[PDB]
Amino acid sequence: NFARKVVEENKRVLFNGLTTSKLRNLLELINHVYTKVYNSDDTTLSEDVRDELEYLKVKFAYESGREPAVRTFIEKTYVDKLVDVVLKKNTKKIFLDYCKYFEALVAYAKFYR
Amino acid sequence: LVVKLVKLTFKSPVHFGMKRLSDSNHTIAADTLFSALIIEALQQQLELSHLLNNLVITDLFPYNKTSYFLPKPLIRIEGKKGDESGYKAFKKLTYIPVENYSEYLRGEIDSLEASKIAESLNLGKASLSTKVSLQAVDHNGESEPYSVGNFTFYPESGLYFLAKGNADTIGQLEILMHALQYSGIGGKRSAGYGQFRCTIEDSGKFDSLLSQTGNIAILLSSAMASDEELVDCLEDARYLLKKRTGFVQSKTYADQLVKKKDFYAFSAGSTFYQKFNGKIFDVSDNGRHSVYRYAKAFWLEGKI
Amino acid sequence: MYSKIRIVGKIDVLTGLHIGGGAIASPVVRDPYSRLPIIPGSSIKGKMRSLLAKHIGDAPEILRLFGSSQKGAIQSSRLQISDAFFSKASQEEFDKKDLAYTETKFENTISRLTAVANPRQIERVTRGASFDFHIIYNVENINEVMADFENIKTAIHLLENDYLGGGGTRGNGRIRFVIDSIDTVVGDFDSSNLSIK
Amino acid sequence: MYSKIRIVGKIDVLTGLHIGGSPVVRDPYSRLPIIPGSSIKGKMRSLLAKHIGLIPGQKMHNQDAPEILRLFGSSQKGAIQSSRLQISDAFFSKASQEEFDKKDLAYTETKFENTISRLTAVANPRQIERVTRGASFDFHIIYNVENINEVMADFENIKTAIHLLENDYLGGGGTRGNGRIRFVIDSIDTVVGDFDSSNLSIK
RNA sequence: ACGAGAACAUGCGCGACAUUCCGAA
């Protein structure tokens, strides 16, 4: 799929030298927000979840600033733009699809290592 | 005599046994259904005269989303000039859709068509559930596992049959079937098997075939004639003898559970050139009540 | 004359339920066609019979309820407990959240001699699941309906405080009964006053 | 006249609890950390067997003391003893969930350790998932009153087990500071039967 | 008067044992 294509394109060292230790903070934040959404039973993302997604976006920006490998990962995978899309649509299904996309991304990145 | 189609859709899997608790049959003969009906009538304290005198029923035949299946006639079929093994297809065929019934009688069904018909049946899946008995454990013993062979139908599959009789018999059968939905049919009814819901309606699709005249007659139920009719009805016949066995399911027949007398009946699909009217035989051996075995003949005429 | 009462409802899985029966380590019993978890009616019948025998204490009432094959006193089973199938509402709820119907539980067994933990895998039905249960009570005698139903209430209470399958002394098989309806489907008996749980 | 005694209450975590499933066991439905009842029952049985006395050369759990087989059950052929204690899975309590939603805790934490070789002194790092200290679990136990005269004594044994569990861990490596828990019993009532359980207590 | 009737796939079993987030400035 798209994750397979982008990981293969960035494979040569993946995403200019990205590892799971670099991503662990973003993964923890993403799965925390995912579990908070999972516990709730609503078709729309709540206000606190929206603020947490904004915090996740700013964490994405901070991690891109910190590391070049994380920066090129974010640029190539459209994860921040996907977060913006999830915020705009405000649908739980779209958020779950984004979480599945991120999980598939990480799985493929580990697979090609 | 009005023919009513009774369609049975099964909620839970059913345990139709032939000789063992592990056997998973997909159908029951007219004997099992008639015994269930008699038990239901005794439960509801109704009269047994209509069941024992004016009810003619067929076996429980499969049906799926597309067609109703009738038993394969035991007719002499001709294959190709060198296709000796192709006959085996017609040997493995058990049920034919009604639309393809007459074609089979005329000999226009090939071996490949017979295999297609055999594989086109979508009744359900037969499985074997393994259970245990922990009653001996509390008495310093061991658990005793056993097996129950069940058969679960596909969502739009089920078992249909045809009933023939007067208006009073038809109505009494409606009440009996309504009670039988919750009594259940088959094996472990009290242990979670045999529950179904039935619908009784008219059958134009089957009245088209039951009004057909021909040179041969096909049995639609497990039947047998008395001696006088058996004298002249067995010439040029192609049949299959089935050994009807079992224990008497009754709380007042005797002290302990005992078997009933061995019976032999012609199968469904047997072809005769003489139509014999069966009866309801007694397979009781000096019991409190007479155990009945229904072997009346529901006939379907056809051209060979 | 003759009456049959239909008791439909839901069995809610309080803790992971394992009723034994591709290659899976200790798989649960399933519907052969839909491959959906089921609660066999034999399991419920046997567990309630054992609980009621413990409570009363075979006893005559157990013979009236669950039937007897004893010589001389051949008793018909008044309770027909059908298999509990995976609920459709629970099916939709589990299809949402991307949740599987069955979970895999990993357990240890620490040896009393070498202090070495032997692993073991079992399969359970997830705690969010529900099963549609259907029971038919046959009124063979009208005078014992109240006694039979109070015995059923006692058995259901014991079952709700007990497990239903697998090793429930180690936190498995806890269940709850929700009685959707108790309606007389056959006969003229009035089951409006009757209640279970 | 069958009797069942229902003991409900809270297991309060004191140090990070890790019961493996290095992730922890979670309920698939709610994705919250869980305490399997098998873990509690096994730890209690092991502690009670050690305290009461372990037969030398013992190989099976069926060779425990008669009190342990009476309480936690025995499976020996012929002498099949049904377990009186049924320890259910302890689920993440809703009060702890509300308390964790405030201050924005994740119900769980990742603890970083390392192993230092004796010779090379190389610290190989590792991570273990734990349940946060403030978390609480709803524990539910059912005691089967089979013999009247042995009820009180059995409860004494249970009390001893609890007194050993509060001084021990529950899962993972508790010799290094994990799994320490405390039991607070909300109620002990005879849920089934006419038995009088007012005087019974396990703490 | 259903190859039927009675029959808990169930009893025992800790995902546990050893492990410094440390050397360096």
Nearest residue to C66 (alpha-carbon basis) of C10, C147, C148, C4: C148
For β-strands B158-165 and B263-266, DSSP reports them as unpaired
Which technique?
Answer: cryo-EM
Q: Using alpha carbons, list the distances in angstroms from residue A99 to A35, A47, C72.
A: 11, 19, 67
Residue whose C-alpha is closest to residue B142's, from C43, D76, C163, C63: D76
Selection from C173, C48, C168 nearest residue D2 by Cα: C48
| Token pair listed for D134 | 């403030």
Query: Which residues in chain A are contacts of D30 at CB distance < 8 A?
Result: 39
Q: Which two tokens stand for residue A57?
A: 């976006």
Structure-token pair, residue B208: 């088209």
B252 touches strand E (CB under 7 A): yes
Please give the resolution of this entry in Å, rounded to 1 decimal. Answer: 2.9
d(CA A65, CA B199): 71
Q: What is the largest CA-CA distance in chain C?
A: 67
Across A37-67, b (16+ Cβ under 10 Å) vs e yields: bbeeeeeebeeebeebbeebbeebeebbeeb
Instruction: Find out whether D71 and D144 touch, Cβ atoms under 8 Å.
Output: no
Contacts of B68 (CB under 8 A, 6+ apart): B61, B97, B98, B160, B205, B206
| Strand E bases within 7 angstroms of protein beta carbons | 1-23
Out of C103, C107, C171, closest to residue D87 by CB: C171
Residues 153-172 of chain C in contact with strand E via CB under 7 angstroms: 163, 165-170
Provide the sign of the torsion angle of the four alpha carbons B87, B93, B94, B100, taken in this order: negative
Residue C98: which residues within 8 A CB-CB, separation 6 or more? A96
Measured CA to C1', the nucleotide nearest B250 is: E1
Quick one: which of B97, B87, B151, B152 has its CA closest to B119?
Answer: B97
Nucleotide nearest to B287 (CA to C1'): E1
C147-168 in b/e form (b: 16+ CB < 10 A) is ebbebbebbbbbbbbbbbbbbb
Q: Which two tokens stand for residue D46?
A: 């092991």
Rg of the Cα atoms in chain D: 19
Interatomic CA distance for residues C155 and C51, integer angstroms: 6
Instruction: Please tell me whether residue A102 adopts helix, strand or coil conformation.
Output: helix
**C107: nearest nucleotide, CA–C1' criterion:** E15
Q: Distances from the Cα of C29 to the Cαs of A33, B217, C32, in angstroms?
A: 36, 46, 9
Residue B113: which residues within 8 A CB-CB, separation 6 or more? B100
Alpha-carbon distances of B191 from B177, B178, C20, C40, C134, rounded to whole Å: 20, 20, 17, 8, 12
Contact D178, D18 (CB under 8 A): yes
* B279 in Cβ contact with B243 (< 8 Å): no
Helix, strand, coil share of chain B (percent; to 5): 25, 25, 50
Per CB-CB distance under 8 Å, the chain A contacts of D97 are 39
Provide the 10 A C-beta neighbour count for residue C114.
9
CA(C109)–C1'(E16) in Å?
8
Q: Report chain C residues whose CB lies below 8 A from the CB of D85.
A: 169
Distance CA D191, CA D9 (A): 14
Q: CA distances (Å), C56 to each of A29, B160, C60, C155, C156, in order?
A: 56, 44, 10, 10, 14
**Phi, psi at B92, each rounded to 5°:** -85, -15
Do residues C68 and B190 make contact, with C-beta atoms less than 8 angstroms apart? no
Binding partners of B (≥3 Cβ pairs within 8 A): C, D
Interchain CB contact of D122 with A (< 8 Å) = no
| DSSP assignment of B128-168 | EEEE---TTGGGT-----EEEEEEEEPTT-EEEEEEEE-HH
Token couple for A34: 């995912």
| CA distance linking residue A101 with residue A7, whole number of Å | 12
Label residues D149-170 b or e (16+ Cβ within 10 Å = b). eebeebbebbebbbebbeebbb
Query: 3-class secondary structure for chain C?
Result: CCEEEEEEEEEEECCCECCECCCCCCCECECCCCCCEEECHHHHHHHHHHHHHHHHCCCHHHHHHHCECCCCCCECCCEEECCEEECHHHHHHHHHHHCCCEEEEEEEEECCCCCCEEEEEEEEECCCCEEEEEEEEEECCCCCHHHHHHHHHHHHHHHHCCECCCCHHHCCCEEEEEEEEEEEEECCCCCCCCCCC
d(CA D101, CA C66): 50
Both tokens assigned to A27: 């993964």
Residue given tokens 């004298």 in the structure block: B231
Find out whether B260 and B254 touch, Cβ atoms under 8 Å.
no
- Counted across chains B and D, CB pairs separated by less than 8 A come out at 5
> Cα separation of C26 and C104, whole Å?
9
Angstrom distance (rounded) from CA B225 to CA B277: 6
Question: Which residues, listed in sequence order, are joined to residue D33 by a DSSP beta bridge?
Answer: D26
Distance between CA atoms of residues D79 and D73, nearest Å = 10
> What span, in angstroms and rounded, lies between the C-alpha atoms of B20 and D116?
66
Position B2, amino acid: V
Q: Find the Cα–Cα–Cα–Cα dihedral D69, D74, D76, D82, rounded to 10°.
A: 120
CB B16 within 8 A of CB B186: yes
Facing residues of C130 across strands?
Answer: C12
Beta carbons of D131 and D24 less than 8 angstroms apart = yes
Output the CA torsion sign for B112, B114, B116, B118: negative
| B111–chain C nearest CA distance, Å | 29
Q: How far apart are CA D75 and CA D69, in angstroms?
A: 9
